[model samples]
Target: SGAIYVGNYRVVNRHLATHNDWANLVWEDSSRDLLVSSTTAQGCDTIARCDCQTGVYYCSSRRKHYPVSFSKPSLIFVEASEYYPARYQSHLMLAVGHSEPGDCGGILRCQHGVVGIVSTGGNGLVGFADVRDLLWLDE
Candidate 1:
């Protein structure tokens, strides 16, 4: 469960399965990449192995970083964006607030686990994926 950049193309390589009804999770190639971890202002949970360099989250198994910042998210609603067609509901949602442009493809996490990869923030809504709807592989 991590995210790596194939040059500039960010690849979120987790949630690697799917079922019927639009649950389309996927994967990517092997690389040393990071997946962000989120927590309350108290900091990361006991179960999380976070990065000390930036006080965020990273996996040395993959060799990458997850940096904490003022722009980090606290929460988001689990709903799809209006961009999808009415007949097709998605595992997507608009961010509760602003996000940096070109920040697409970053991993989004809650206190529970990863929510999804950052999709886009055009039209004033920062969109992301909801990974729970799909099946995950045991690594």
Candidate 2:
């Protein structure tokens, strides 16, 4: 499954399936994207992968995981102003306190029935996010 990916998240030739420790948990509307609290096989603060088709997704990285519920998270960050030209959410909190500094704390958005990427307006966030997939959490 494939669609839009954000942060350090990217499309890989590897395949993701329900057997990668899937639970078949229904989180929210099929049209809405969801955040993932898992990890990379290589271990990113947390990472996620999507087939774009909904079933059981396998995250690529995480140290601690919450249910799919935390997928809908409020991105807390310091807004960019004249003082700070960059508004990055790595400065934000995740499922708990997880952070992917080099990455955007990783998120998945569905082009079809799949994806929650951190909503943002800065280069760091915008660099990896799909313009249509992003949703604002912090006003």
Candidate 3:
């Protein structure tokens, strides 16, 4: 037998892009810090940008699956662009928090008909889940 649970399904964030190549996903917490993810990377490392004025960092990679939770809903940020830096000059940047979960999944941010960012681990695994159905409510 099986059970089920009911809860509110909110559209965490809506990404706007004309093409399917590149996209950006940005998320923010209570502290005002942002978590940016994408699917644009030349190698293992992800390319990220930081705005000193806004204290926001933009991240991009090329992996599927990303962080998900019920209690701690994460804000997602996304962008679309044509320019992508190489791995040699790329850097990985993510927000640090006590409540933040470990690298459970990889965030995919598509932009400008290109995969701009893909966040994953050193092993090259995008996330723990194999399929989208794995991410669902618990009873």
Candidate 4:
């Protein structure tokens, strides 16, 4: 039912990571503007679970689930890394990822044996809570 990475993360969605191509989930339309203005590292690490099978990543303690776009939740990981200034500084990046477990493991840019924590969310994230607060560079 699930997979365990060598570290402290677990596999939730196999669509992109495993190339499973599970098309039963959706969010709004496409990568909608998630943030606005700018956010001063509002704290990540919130602890969450990855349920890619359902096209969603739920934050742990926060008790909140972000139903990203079935189109490409990976965008969240991609954009956050690129936009967020404290990206690398914050270990709780909350950036999920794709790619199988062994050989074919990697997100968008970074690959296996890379920085060590590179991860993709899902695919294209369309809608989530306060979509406008997580836009690509918007905030």
Indicate which candidate wins on lDDT.
1
- Deviation in angstroms for 70 in model 3? 26
Higher-lDDT candidate of 2 and 4:
2
Q: Candidate 4 on 1-139: residue-level lDDT in tens?
A: 1222322223222222222212222222223211112122342222222322223443332334443233223333233533233222212123333322221122111112111122333342222221212222111
The candidate maximizing TM-score is 1
Report the C-alpha lDDT of model 1 over 19-61, residue by residue, as the tens digit. 3211322333211111222212332212212211112333232
TM-score of each model, paired residue for residue: 0.37, 0.25, 0.15, 0.18
lDDT of 1 at 19: 35
Where does model 4 exceed 4 Å of error?
A: 1-54, 73-139
Single out the weakest 10-residue window by summed lDDT for candidate 1.
45-54
Better of 2 and 3 by lDDT: 2
For model 1, name the residue pairs that clash: none
The per-residue C-alpha lDDT of model 3 at residue 5 equals: 14
Candidate 2 weakest lDDT stretch, 10 residues: 24-33
Please tell me which model should have the higher TM-score, number 2 or number 4.
2
Model 3, 1-139: lDDT tens digits are 0001113211111121213212343222212111222333222322222222112112233222333211111223322222222221122223321111232222322221111222222333221111122123211
Residue 118 C-alpha lDDT in model 1: 53
In model 4, what is the error at residue 59, expressed in angstroms?
1.7
